């Protein structure tokens, strides 16, 4: 777990995608997914609906966020669709006057540690959630509200680690949650904000390595209420401070030589730990699942027709789909299938009769050659 050696010195509505893991066949078991992403703050209520009522047993992934600090979650459950059943996803968020309902329509390597602290004045201590990733696969989690109060495994290949690993990781993620709790009280005072408001502090930490496994880039950055706070620059020698409050943190961390400590850890322990994980999970992390591609042609009228280019079951999540006009293409965000693979599609409305003139360009590292269909 990352070190975090020193203490300190907005609203986005969720994007909702409801879909099945595999193509829906009546009477065949499947998985109903609701992927919410690109929202801030983190608190969100997501429900899966079937024939006008809530599906009682629904699981969800651990809270994480993208590079732009926006959160994403996957709500999922097993189901068997029939001809009569109608399914939808209901999402409640501070950005919505009422819950929104969406109906169901039938290489290099990196390690990251993400953390989110959400204050809840009057309702006790802030909620701290931390997750760890290798490429696009999560392997550890910690929830300060959980009964275990331990770093928990979230990937099969991390269960190999002995008790000394889990003792060390739990104590370090616990110390981080206390540091970020004190940081929340510091940011409250520096910005002269009321004590009755809820605030969010996010942190990101990790390293990049190339194909040879040697160090490439290192990262350590903070976000407060969805806005950049402080960030370690690319040279791992100085900081980027967003506002005057963060400039106080920058000068404090400069005198303590925090950048020198983070640079040594990023180029050392982070790379050594990422190299170990890539080996133990070789059959998982060092695999390349190529996309299962297919195209659909269904007209929306007699004037126009819609062509959708599908890509299914690929890993990692990086992919590129193109038909070149970028203003006439609908491009959904890459979504997880729930089994470790990812999905994406590209659509374009097209004058009827000119279907055989359009082609889809598929780019993925799991393909020896980029496909054209």
């Amino acid at each position, epitope marked *: 777990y990352p070190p975090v050696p020193e203490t300190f010195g907005i609203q986005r509505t969720p994007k909702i995608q409801v879909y099945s893991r595999h193509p829906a066949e009546n009477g065949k078991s499947n998985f109903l997914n609701c992927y919410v992403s690109g929202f801030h703050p983190s608190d969100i209520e997501v429900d899966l609906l079937k*024939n*006008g009522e*809530r599906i009682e047993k629904v699981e969800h992934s651990d809270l994480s966020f993208s590079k732009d600090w926006s959160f994403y979650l996957l709500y999922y459950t097993e189901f068997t669709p029939t001809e009569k059943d109608e399914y939808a996803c209901r999402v*409640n968020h*501070v*950005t*919505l*006057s009422q819950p929104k*309902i969406v109906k169901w329509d039938r290489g290099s390597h990196s390690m990251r540690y993400f953390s989110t602290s959400v204050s809840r004045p009057g309702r006790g201590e802030p909620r701290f959630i931390a997750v760890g990733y290798v490429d696009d696969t999560q392997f550890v989690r910690f929830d300060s509200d959980a009964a275990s109060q331990r770093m928990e495994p979230r990937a099969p290949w991390i269960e190999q680690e002995g008790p000394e690993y889990w003792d060390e990781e739990t104590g370090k993620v616990k110390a981080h949650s206390q540091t970020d709790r004190e940081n929340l009280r510091i940011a409250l005072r520096c910005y002269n904000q009321s004590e009755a408001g809820s605030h969010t502090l996010q942190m990101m930490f990790g390293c990049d390595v190339g194909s040879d496994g040697r160090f490439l880039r290192g990262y350590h950055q903070y976000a407060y209420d969805g806005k950049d706070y402080i960030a370690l620059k690319e040279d791992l020698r100085s900081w980027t401070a967003a506002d005057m409050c963060a400039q106080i943190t920058k000068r404090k961390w400069e005198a303590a030589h925090v950048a020198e400590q983070q640079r040594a850890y990023l180029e050392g322990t982070c790379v050594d730990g990422l190299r170990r994980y890539l080996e133990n999970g070789k059959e998982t992390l060092q695999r390349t699942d190529p996309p299962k591609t297919h195209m659909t042609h269904h007209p929306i009228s007699d004037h126009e027709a819609t062509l959708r280019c599908w890509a299914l079951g690929f890993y990692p999540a990086e992919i590129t789909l193109t038909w070149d006009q970028t203003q006439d293409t609908e491009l959904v965000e890459t979504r997880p299938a729930g089994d470790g693979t990812f999905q994406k599609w590209a659509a374009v409305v097209v004058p009827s009769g000119e279907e055989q003139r359009y082609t889809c360009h598929v780019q993925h590292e799991g393909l020896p050659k980029p496909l054209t269909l």
Partner: nanobody
Amino acid sequence: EVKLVESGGGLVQPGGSLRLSCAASGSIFSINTMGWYRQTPGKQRDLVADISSGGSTKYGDSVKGRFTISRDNTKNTVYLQMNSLKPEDTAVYYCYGLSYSNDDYWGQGTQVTVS
């Protein structure tokens, strides 16, 4: 299509109790889930309690054990028994229903005030 008639509410002191009711007008088997959301001081509304035609219910965490929801399917009417009311329970409570095709309907709301 579907009309939701709300009634109840009022003005009460802390520790007091209040009732709510909401009836659905239209087709007999037109509505599945019925319940209440309440307006936060901000923009969003939070779930208070709802119940399906089969009796499955869910409560918001802040009202569990204090509020109790019931339903009469023969009249398409739900009832909300609120006890141990607190000032933070003061809000406009919107009744809502869900069609079997997952279409939502909303009442105009009913005011509840606790000192």
